[PDB]
Amino acid sequence: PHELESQFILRLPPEYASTVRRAVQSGHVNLKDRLTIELHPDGRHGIVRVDRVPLASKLVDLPCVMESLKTIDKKTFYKTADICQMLVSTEKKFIWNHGITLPLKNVRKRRFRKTAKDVEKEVKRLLSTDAEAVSTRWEIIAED
Amino acid sequence: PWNLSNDEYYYPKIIQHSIPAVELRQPFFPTHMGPIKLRQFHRPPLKKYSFGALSQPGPHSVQPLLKHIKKKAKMREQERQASGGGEMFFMRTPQDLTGKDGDLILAEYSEENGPLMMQVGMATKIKNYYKRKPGKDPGAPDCKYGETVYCHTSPFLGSLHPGQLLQAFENNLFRAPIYLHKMPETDFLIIRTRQGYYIRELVDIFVVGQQCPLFEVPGPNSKRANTHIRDFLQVFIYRLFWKSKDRPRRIRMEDIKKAFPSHSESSIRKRLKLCADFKRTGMDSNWWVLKSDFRLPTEEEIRAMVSPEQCCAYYSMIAAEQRLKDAGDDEVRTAPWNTTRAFIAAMKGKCLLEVTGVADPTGCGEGFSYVKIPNKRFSVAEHQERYKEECQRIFDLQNKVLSSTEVLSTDATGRCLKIYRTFRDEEGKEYVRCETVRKPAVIDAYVRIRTTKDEEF
Amino acid sequence: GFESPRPYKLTHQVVCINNINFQRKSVVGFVELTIFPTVANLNRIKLNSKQCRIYRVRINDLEAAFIYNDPTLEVCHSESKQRNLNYFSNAYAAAVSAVDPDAGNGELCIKVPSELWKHVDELKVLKIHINFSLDQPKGGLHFVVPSVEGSMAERGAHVFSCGYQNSTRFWFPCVDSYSELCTWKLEFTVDAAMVAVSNGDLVETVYTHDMRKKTFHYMLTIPTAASNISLAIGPFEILVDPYMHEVTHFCLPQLLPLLKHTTSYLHEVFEFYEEILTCRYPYSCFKTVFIDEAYVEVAAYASMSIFSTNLLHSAMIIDETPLTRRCLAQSLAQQFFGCFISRMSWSDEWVLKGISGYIYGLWMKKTFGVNEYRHWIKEELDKIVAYELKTGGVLLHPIFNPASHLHFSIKHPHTLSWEYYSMFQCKAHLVMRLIENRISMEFMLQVFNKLLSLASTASSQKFQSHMWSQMLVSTSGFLKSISNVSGKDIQPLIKQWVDQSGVVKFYGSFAFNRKRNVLELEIKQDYTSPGTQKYVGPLKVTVQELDGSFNHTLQIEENSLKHDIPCHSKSRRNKKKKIPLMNGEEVDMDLSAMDADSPLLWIRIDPDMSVLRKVEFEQADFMWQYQLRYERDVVAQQESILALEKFPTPASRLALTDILEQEQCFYRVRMSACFCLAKIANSMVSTWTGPPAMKSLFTRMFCCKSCPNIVKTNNFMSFQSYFLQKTMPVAMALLRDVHNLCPKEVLTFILDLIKYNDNRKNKFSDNYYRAEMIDALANSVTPAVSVNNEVRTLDNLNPDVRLILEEITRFLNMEKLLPSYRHTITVSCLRAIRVLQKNGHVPSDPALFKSYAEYGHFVDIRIAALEAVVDYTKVDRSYEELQWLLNMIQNDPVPYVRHKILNMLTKNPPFTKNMESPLCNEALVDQLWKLMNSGTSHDWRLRCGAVDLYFTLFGLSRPSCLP
């Protein structure tokens, strides 16, 4: 079978980003030894090791949706993957408010329309507790 | 001396996808999307592998792929020059759609949930619309990507200024203004697969403005919706019959039940009733063999049954159905069937749109709202001109804000719910737990089930 | 690749004109050509010249000897007793080929002096200075000099260059081919009160030392041919376009407000033609000249167009705005693709005519709507299938005879019949629409942009034709550019519709198989008629069934007859649901007339007109009525109207009446439904129940609610109920009773429409509506019951016709005091008097029409009166009227009138070859042979018209009525 590839964006500190960029544009396999990525079983924490120097990482959710688009002639572009996550290196904490491009900053707060009426999972847990019970008493309340 | 052809009563109103996309192959075009997969629609999380090299916990080296990129590009140029030197079609396999080769650009979206969105494997074009200056003009400012076209009639809602080039994504699904920005100096692109990590740099990232929809998303329980569900199931059944190696072609029912698990089996039987029959005993037992008089349709007929853009419109409809369902009339107006119907009707000239409203995906004055207003002490030129000028103003504000490289500084009853629970502890006990829910969101979802279960008797 | 047929290459030409004398009708001038010999030993140089008296010729300021002979002056000898037309056609083709600049030939043969042979062998420049004089031109320059006294600017006298194709040899010596491109320098010394308009841009205007004359200097740096060079000298009122500022409009004096209103649309035509093609307008200026006694209604030269003043209308004139608008549009289309990109041979003319007509049709589509585009395309296709089934066929791109089925030679444009030239341009633009159907419209516009871009990179070089021949298109270059932009070649389509000269005829009939639910079509072709050919390609058919509209492609090979296509359900008759149409909409249909067993509502063979075809489909009458009512295609509604005349059932009357009542139907379908309803009403007399047809509908739509017989006061601001209102009594007058006489209920209705007409309140004129009222009065005239050939006097007049005669007398006399826009009521009243004379009502006397056909009248009155005289001399076998018409062909001042008299005498001939007539002398054969041979030697359009008249009257063999 075929499994859709999973692309994400890696953001590094600027000096380490310059060393990683120089090693990528060089093209040797020396970069392979220099750059490693260890993702912790939390799922939202990691180490990126640049030149064997550990950096602390967080996998965050991006507010917009990006899409990688490949081309052969630079006139027709084929969508290859959807990017929604970034492993910035240096829950509410795992949500990034800004977008990658310069015009998109504070997009989640300002350029996103918010419509409102985790919570569903809590309601399911409450229903399960009511089922495991015997007698349930309920009242919409006031200030108390 | 005028038109005099009643054209609105007689006539009321190129993209080649990859061979995995036009054949609707199941990684790229899913048969069924559950609720947690509809909430993560076009935002796929980073899954943990169970088997593979990355499934073992520990540090993992990323691998540079620049010999791979230039080897694949040199190989594709050899293929193109061996085939006569013209333009070729290369995306014939799923392994052609990897990010490991070719010139990748990134495309960011301004809206959170667009009315239409491309699946993986589908093609789009970049068109550079350039309105010439009055009289003499030097020529279109040249651009790295796309082809240039001179537009006297603006494709979008606003109109282009003289001497203004605007790039845009153009395909069958939408048409949307894009703006080229340079990448940040810190961000790279990591392509992870089961075997390892791979790293590319990126240099070009476009920002995609508000989409102008060219395909109408169907509504829920619509006739077009049910027709697409039936045709998609039929195409999947035909492609399972084509994949069968048995000389009387035969399939199993629980393959289709694995693909479409929300379907009642009465509908799947209905699709298999014509073109197949069930063998209970003897050879081919518990199989749905193909009828001997039935000619299985060819590949081009199966491609003519369902289009990939219809699948994208259906996925937009069911994702919006989930988001509306989770959030308990303003929201219903912002649903893509309403907004796509409004925009396509405005493009034929049926009706006008209030460009400031609640269907505005920004939530501020930037961007349009595609909801229908009637085209009616002026009742004619005043309304039309007012709508037109508001359209040019919004188009021009969005272009400026999006192309800005300026840095932006980081910035009813009032009643809670209380529940008493009675349980029995180990040995013998009867403790009672009183729990108070102060979250009005938890409240609404909780109560709605009881009121439903109270009527469910 | 273009290789010249001439042994020299012409680089630059100076045309200087002095002494334009309007009293004596004379010009003097010189011409200086700058040729580079391409072959050594050039010796003779052969140039083209007609009617010019060549005074002296100097080559490199050395006196040279010339000899002039024109074989096309007298084509056959006077003392040859041949009288067949094939002899004259071969001799005329040989004579035109002997003066052809497209071969090496020419009429003026200049001998290079001996001392320049060492200058010509090593190939160096030669400057030939001819000076000439036109003494009193019979062609080329037309002098319109009115007989009011005063100065020549005070009386309105002007000159313009007339003619078609290569007719610039008629006023200066040149290389009069479309392939000899050169740069130009044009000087004209005219009177001080006059302006000289020509090609190029006006670099200066200097006075003469007496300040009584001034010289206009024009320069043309874009290399054009000699055939695209024009001239208009007159006392023109100049108007700069207030929108585009390089465009100047010139009109005759006192016609400036008409020019302001008329030429106010042209900037939108410029914007369209520069927005579908991506090239700007190639010339640096544009000049529109409006003149009197024009050759054609619109002529297009390089950077200049010459229209007639009869196109000029005011703001209150409707029914003339679209015609003038489309004349301006096709002049601009020919500016792009007849004058900038020129022709490489006489073959490859179909390319230029097709591109001009095709982009003009795209303009008509955007401007007047897709429905007007479809109606225009259908009327052009019906025109060509009528002409090609009538006589042989039109052959685009012949190979050099290739077409021997027709009485003239197609090797040169000046031997073609004028009807063949018109059908040539018509077929060329329809074949270009077919090429757009195979290769999509955006690729087609990319082809045209590639041709224009090659021409405009070519147009700026100075190399003498190393690169100036990229401005000349050919067929092979056009097909190669098509294959470059698309990757498909159209060589089967080119081989079928260009190289082969025929249209196809389809006879279709269907049968529905209820058992297998299929539709068995039966399409057979008539390929043994003289104009036809056999089609073997694919064929689209559109079937409207209850489940919707489905298209099917049929492969019609030679041995094919029965095509079984599948049919869908009939479950939209089980439930009442709406039936979906060809577009996205759906309607409620009354399915009571439909068959119970068949789902299919109508069938259309080749709906998109993708072949050059004539379809004869055999549907049932209810299918034609459903196709008339619920179709969303105007050509299918028109063909259902045309096919409902054979079914006079009352359901068809209900169908046409529902079409007539229906706004949001295209107006030209309702105008056809009027005449179809009149024919059906005439066929079901002694069955018709109530009032006459369309009368109650006219009183419901256009009359007052309180008074049914009083018409509403005229408000013509809707432009669709105006056309329907002015066409409905014209069809209503074709009603006839059981006695074959028009009823006195419809004639009284038309007379009350005439009496109660009030036009003091609309912003538009009433001349076309009143002219159509006279046409409706003329339609009601039935033949009178003369007893014993009783002389038609005033007392034994019909009581019906006395009212009609009083009305047309009142209208014609009121036109003599308050004239209409183009004397439309004079034309309608002369036509009605000829209608009354054709029946036995008014005495058959041509003296009235002979007085209206004099020179000083308006040209529409003249051609209406001459049409009446041609009809009289056909019916009364008049010898002296035929001699009057032939004399008027020989010496009339306006050449358009001479061409029109020959045209009308060809269309309505006094006798055919089958008839024994008293007018079949040897004297008439000798007169018409002298008119073909000599006499018409100065026009190239009168000579082809005389050939057409001799063919119509005496045929291709020897005139029979002869010793």
UniProtKB/Swiss-Prot annotation, chain A:
Modified residues (Phosphoserine): S128
Tissue and organ distribution: Ubiquitous.
Reported modifications of this chain: Phosphorylated by CIITA. Ubiquitinated by TRIM26; leading to proteasomal degradation.
Record-annotated membrane-spanning stretches: none
Localization annotation: Nucleus
Organism superkingdom: Eukaryota
Anything else known: Overexpression of TAF7 in HeLa cells inhibits cyclin D1 and cyclin A gene transcription and causes the cells to accumulate in early S phase. In contrast, depletion of TAF7 from TFIID complexes by siRNAs increases histone H3 acetylation at both cyclin promoters and stimulates cyclins CCND1 and CCNA gene transcription.
Subunit (UniProt): Component of the TFIID basal transcription factor complex, composed of TATA-box-binding protein TBP, and a number of TBP-associated factors (TAFs), including TAF1, TAF2, TAF3, TAF4, TAF5, TAF6, TAF7, TAF8, TAF9, TAF10, TAF11, TAF12 and TAF13. Part of a TFIID-containing RNA polymerase II pre-initiation complex that is composed of TBP and at least GTF2A1, GTF2A2, GTF2E1, GTF2E2, GTF2F1, GTF2H2, GTF2H3, GTF2H4, GTF2H5, GTF2B, TCEA1, ERCC2, ERCC3, TAF1, TAF2, TAF3, TAF4, TAF5, TAF6, TAF7, TAF8, TAF9, TAF10, TAF11, TAF12 and TAF13. Interacts with TAF1; the interaction is direct.
Job of this protein: The TFIID basal transcription factor complex plays a major role in the initiation of RNA polymerase II (Pol II)-dependent transcription. TFIID recognizes and binds promoters with or without a TATA box via its subunit TBP, a TATA-box-binding protein, and promotes assembly of the pre-initiation complex (PIC). The TFIID complex consists of TBP and TBP-associated factors (TAFs), including TAF1, TAF2, TAF3, TAF4, TAF5, TAF6, TAF7, TAF8, TAF9, TAF10, TAF11, TAF12 and TAF13. TAF7 forms a promoter DNA binding subcomplex of TFIID, together with TAF1 and TAF2.
UniProt similarity note: Belongs to the TAF7 family.
Name assigned to this protein: Transcription initiation factor TFIID subunit 7
Gene behind the chain: TAF7
From Swiss-Prot, chain B:
Keyword Ubl conjugation tagged: yes
Coiled coil: none
Region: Histone acetyltransferase (HAT), residue numbers: 1-376
Post-translational modification: Phosphorylated by casein kinase II in vitro.
Keyword Flavoprotein found: no
Any Gene Ontology biological process: transcription by RNA polymerase II
GO cellular component terms given for this protein: chromatin; MLL1 complex; nucleoplasm; nucleus; transcription factor TFIID complex; transcription regulator complex
GO molecular function, one term: RNA polymerase II general transcription initiation factor binding
Predominant localisation class: nucleus
Cell location: Nucleus
Keyword terms, alphabetized: Acetylation, Acyltransferase, ATP-binding, Bromodomain, Cell cycle, Disease variant, DNA-binding, Dystonia, Host-virus interaction, Intellectual disability, Isopeptide bond, Kinase, Nucleotide-binding, Nucleus, Parkinsonism, Phosphoprotein, Repeat, Serine/threonine-protein kinase, Transcription, Transcription regulation, Transferase, Ubl conjugation
Resulting phenotype, M117I: In a lung bronchoalveolar carcinoma sample; somatic mutation
Annotated disease: Dystonia 3, torsion, X-linked: An X-linked dystonia-parkinsonism disorder. Dystonia is defined by the presence of sustained involuntary muscle contractions, often leading to abnormal postures. DYT3 is characterized by severe progressive torsion dystonia followed by parkinsonism. It has a well-defined pathology of extensive neuronal loss and mosaic gliosis in the striatum (caudate nucleus and putamen) which appears to resemble that in Huntington disease. Intellectual developmental disorder, X-linked, syndromic 33: A syndrome characterized by intellectual deficit, delayed psychomotor development, delayed speech and language, and characteristic facial features.
Similarity comment text for this entry: Belongs to the TAF1 family.
Domain notes: The Bromo domain mediates interaction with histones that have acetylated lysine residues at specific positions. The second domain also recognizes and binds histones that are butyrylated and crotonylated.
Name of protein: Transcription initiation factor TFIID subunit 1
Gene: TAF1
Covered residues, full protein: 585 to 1226 of 1893
From Swiss-Prot, chain C:
Keyword list, A-Z: Disease variant, Intellectual disability, Nucleus, Phosphoprotein, Transcription, Transcription regulation
Cellular compartments annotated: Nucleus
Keyword check for Transcription: yes
Gene Ontology annotations for the cellular component aspect, listed alphabetically: nucleoplasm; nucleus; transcription factor TFIID complex; transcription factor TFTC complex
Tissue: Expressed in all tissues tested.
Any one Gene Ontology molecular-function term assigned to this protein's record: chromatin binding
GO biological process: G2/M transition of mitotic cell cycle; mRNA transcription by RNA polymerase II; positive regulation of DNA-templated transcription; positive regulation of transcription initiation by RNA polymerase II; regulation of DNA repair; regulation of transcription by RNA polymerase II; RNA polymerase II preinitiation complex assembly; transcription initiation at RNA polymerase II promoter
Coiled coil (UniProt feature): none
Superkingdom as given in the UniProt entry: Eukaryota
Effect of T168R: In NEDFCF; uncertain significance
Note: PubMed:9418870 was unable to show an association between TAF2 and TFIID.
Family: Belongs to the TAF2 family.
Quaternary organization: Component of the TFIID basal transcription factor complex, composed of TATA-box-binding protein TBP, and a number of TBP-associated factors (TAFs), including TAF1, TAF2, TAF3, TAF4, TAF5, TAF6, TAF7, TAF8, TAF9, TAF10, TAF11, TAF12 and TAF13. Interacts with TAF2C1. Component of the TFTC-HAT complex.
Disease: Neurodevelopmental disorder with feeding difficulties, thin corpus callosum, and foot deformity: An autosomal recessive disorder characterized by impaired intellectual development, microcephaly, delayed psychomotor development, pyramidal signs, thin corpus callosum, and foot deformity.
Protein name: Transcription initiation factor TFIID subunit 2
High-level lineage: Eukaryota, Metazoa, Chordata, Craniata, Vertebrata
Name of the encoding gene: TAF2
Full protein: residues contained: 19 to 988 of 1199
